[PDB]
Amino acid sequence: MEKTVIYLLEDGYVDFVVEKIRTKMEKLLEEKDKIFVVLAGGRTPLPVYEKLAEQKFPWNRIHFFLSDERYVPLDSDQSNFRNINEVLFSRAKIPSGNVHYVDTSLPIEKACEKYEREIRSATDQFDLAILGMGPDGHVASIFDLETGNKDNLVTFTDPSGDPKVPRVTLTFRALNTSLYVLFLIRGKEKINRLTEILKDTPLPAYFVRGKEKTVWFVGK
């Protein structure tokens, strides 16, 4: 059945997480020809991607999707695409067509719709989602429950978060098509958020679950 698993790590956080994601992707690749993985930006996931890019994977069989994007230029240090491209997309030799991101050069709604069409065309279900969670409990760029509950795979927001800029984000519906959802969080503040989630506090992250499993890698 489907449930949630929480790992509390005291040491070697990044290496542990990398090994777990590595094993899972290896297993997935033994089962299917192509796998689709969603990636969140942020300071905790980046180091992990940096190491994953060094692994010998058949990159042409792995497709990546950003979980969300800040509506700013793609070469901005505030761009999730720029940051993930720096540690992964431009380091691992992943075919250009296998990488999907939000085209912020377009009007925000058009960037949303283009991204949604791309996602639907590539797959009807994600295999793995590697997500982070803010100290406020938000996931991807879902700060308000209304945003997460949008009846689309992709939606956009008014200026939100920090940086306080408009965002384009996958919805709860899109994220929940993931077979496995992995949350990567570190620190007392986020541990506080997770405990509130354990007590059924409806923070955004509380609503994202994998169809098979949801795993939290916690760096206490």
Side-chain angles (χ1 to χ4, degrees):
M1 68 179 81
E2 167 297 290
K3 63 287 201 173
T4 293
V5 181
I6 300 164
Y7 286 88
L8 301 178
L9 315 171
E10 308 285 323
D11 244 53
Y13 182 79
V14 176
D15 292 323
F16 185 84
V17 178
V18 168
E19 174 52 25
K20 282 287 179 295
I21 295 174
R22 186 200 68 66
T23 295
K24 185 56 187 171
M25 291 179 75
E26 279 279 271
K27 289 173 292 190
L28 286 167
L29 286 166
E30 303 184 309
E31 308 175 329
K32 323 158 52 173
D33 178 50
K34 301 181 297 183
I35 64 175
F36 306 85
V37 183
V38 171
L39 307 177
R43 294 183 295 162
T44 297
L46 296 173
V48 168
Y49 304 154
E50 187 160 36
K51 297 289 195 171
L52 283 174
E54 286 156 33
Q55 309 297 284
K56 294 301 178 183
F57 282 116
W59 297 119
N60 61 305
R61 293 174 57 201
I62 307 178
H63 301 66
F64 291 110
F65 305 81
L66 267 60
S67 59
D68 68 289
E69 184 56 276
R70 286 74 174 292
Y71 192 65
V72 298
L74 291 177
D75 55 5
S76 175
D77 68 316
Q78 300 187 311
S79 173
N80 289 333
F81 165 76
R82 180 181 160 182
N83 287 291
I84 299 173
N85 181 50
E86 297 188 335
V87 295
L88 179 64
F89 306 148
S90 67
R91 288 187 56 249
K93 292 192 182 181
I94 302 154
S96 178
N98 283 36
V99 178
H100 309 271
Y101 56 82
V102 178
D103 186 355
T104 59
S105 77
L106 300 179
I108 200 163
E109 173 174 285
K110 301 300 194 180
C112 280
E113 307 182 321
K114 174 179 168 170
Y115 195 45
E116 187 159 327
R117 290 192 297 272
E118 271 192 48
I119 288 173
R120 294 183 177 281
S121 178
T123 182
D124 53 44
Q125 157 191 285
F126 297 122
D127 291 293
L128 180 72
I130 306 178
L131 309 176
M133 173 194 71
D136 67 327
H138 80 274
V139 62
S141 267
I142 301 169
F143 293 89
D144 298 299
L145 298 189
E146 188 189 342
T147 303
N149 296 320
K150 285 285 181 177
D151 188 39
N152 303 294
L153 294 179
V154 192
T155 191
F156 64 91
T157 75
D158 298 333
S160 305
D162 189 42
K164 189 176 178 180
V165 297
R167 316 292 190 93
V168 172
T169 186
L170 294 186
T171 57
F172 289 154
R173 177 186 161 191
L175 295 170
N176 289 341
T177 61
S178 301
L179 301 181
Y180 272 80
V181 170
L182 312 183
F183 277 107
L184 283 49
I185 57 162
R186 302 182 73 166
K188 304 183 182 173
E189 195 55 42
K190 291 177 182 186
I191 288 172
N192 274 0
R193 296 294 80 72
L194 175 58
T195 62
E196 301 173 339
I197 281 170
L198 293 182
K199 297 189 284 192
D200 301 304
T201 304
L203 306 174
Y206 172 83
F207 297 103
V208 181
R209 310 286 177 93
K211 298 187 210 174
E212 302 187 0
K213 192 193 300 188
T214 301
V215 185
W216 291 73
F217 289 114
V218 187
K220 358 196 324 148

